[PDB]
Point group: C2
Chain length 57, copies 2
């Protein structure tokens, strides 16, 4: 049972480290995603203004 | 020792489940990221197109 406890402790430490790394990567990806969402919203605004001017002309 | 092993295993499963949920969130967000990337590319192409269209108009 002591050997089993050692195995479990090592497995859990590995899993916790991996989870922390994945959380960091998720936060970075979320920042990138919101920046690109802002970019897309700007593009949509400009395209809408373009279409309005097109229909006016 | 068995009590310690039981706590260690429980902690391992909780960290593993949080890791798996984090991974599925990661892949769903990557899907959304690729989708919005393609969307923004299409908006930029349409913006250019509409620019020359309005010039000709």
């Amino acid at each position: 049972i002591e050997s089993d406890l050692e195995r479990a402790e090592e497995r859990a430490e590995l899993s916790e480290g991996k989870c922390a790394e994945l959380e960091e990567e998720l936060k970075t990806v979320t920042n990138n995603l919101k920046s690109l969402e802002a970019q897309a919203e700007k593009y949509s605004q400009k395209e809408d203004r373009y279409e309005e001017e097109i229909k006016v002309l």
